[PDB]
Amino acid sequence: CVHHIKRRDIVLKWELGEGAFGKVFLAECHNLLPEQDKMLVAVKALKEASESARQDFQREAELLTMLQHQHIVRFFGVCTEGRPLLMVFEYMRHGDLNRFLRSHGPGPLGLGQLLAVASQVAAGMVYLAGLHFVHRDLATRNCLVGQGLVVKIGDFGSTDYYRMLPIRWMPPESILYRKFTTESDVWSFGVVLWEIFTYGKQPWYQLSNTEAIDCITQGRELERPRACPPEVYAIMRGCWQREPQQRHSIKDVHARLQALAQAPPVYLDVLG
Numbered sequence: 001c002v003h004h005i006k007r008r009d010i011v012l013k014w015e016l017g018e019g020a021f022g023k024v025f026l027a028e029c030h031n032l033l034p035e036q037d038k039m040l041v042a043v044k045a046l047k048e049a050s051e052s053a054r055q056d057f058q059r060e061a062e063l064l065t066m067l068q069h070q071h072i073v074r075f076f077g078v079c080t081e082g083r084p085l086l087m088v089f090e091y092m093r094h095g096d097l098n099r100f101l102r103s104h105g106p107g108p109l110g111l112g113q114l115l116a117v118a119s120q121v122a123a124g125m126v127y128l129a130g131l132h133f134v135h136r137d138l139a140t141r142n143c144l145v146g147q148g149l150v151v152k153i154g155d156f157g158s159t160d161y162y163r164m165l166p167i168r169w170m171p172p173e174s175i176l177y178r179k180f181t182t183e184s185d186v187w188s189f190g191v192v193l194w195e196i197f198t199y200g201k202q203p204w205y206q207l208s209n210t211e212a213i214d215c216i217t218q219g220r221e222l223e224r225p226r227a228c229p230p231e232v233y234a235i236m237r238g239c240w241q242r243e244p245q246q247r248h249s250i251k252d253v254h255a256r257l258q259a260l261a262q263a264p265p266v267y268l269d270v271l272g
């Protein structure tokens, strides 16, 4: 069952972003949580109102209700009092993980912080894998950053897709055969790892979309980032086995990252 929010409980304050789908606003929502009379929330308003989109909306709302985890962006409910159709989410003040990485990179984040970021993304992916859920578009741009470096996995909907697919995050079987699995999500996490330790640099930045496709399908691996300890690079490479059956489990990848997250390796980006 999907929770319904009364329109006059939502008070729109500021547009946070926009795409083809519609708009995202910062808002104050009343009668949502008991201790909080007024609390901040992220409101997604959808452009289309037609039944083809309206049924697709409820479908999304249902799935969003069923996904409940610490590192998955919280869905609070819906407002189906005509057009526009509203979707309420928790407020993540720092926005997407890609922009946060670039803006807190060459104060810049430390080894322990980047590992805290990585482990949090792995935790959410473990949750997803457990439900047999395939994200298909895992990347830092789809992760959100809240108060006190709390990282959650979400999903938005520009030059990051070829004709459309985020090829640079995709393994060969997904590029060639269009097959997205739990194993293809592990490959993506490996690329998310590269992105974290490069402070949000685009995978294969020295290459074009078409050139990168040939580079991935031939089995070329992204080089070890300067800020990346070799223990973390081993984790990435394990996510990048040509054979999906030979790629590590996300449960395992998280376990290894969590070990480093609590016991940070004595590493310095300068010496190598």
Ligand SMILES: Cn1cnc(-c2cnc(O[C@H]3CCN(C(=O)Cc4ccc(OC(F)(F)F)cc4)C[C@H]3F)c(C(N)=O)c2)c1
Pocket: 016, 017, 024, 041, 042, 044, 067, 072, 073, 074, 089, 090, 091, 092, 093, 094, 095, 096, 128, 135, 142, 144, 153, 154, 155, 156
């Ligand atoms: C400049 N700037 C500063 N802050 C912002 C900002 C912009 N947008 C935000 O909210 C958006 C972000 C995208 N989004 C999802 O991620 C839904 C969603 C999909 C899938 C899923 O499940 C899955 F895939 F993870 F399993 C979970 C969840 C809808 C909505 F929340 C927020 C903000 N949240 O405050 C903050 C922009």
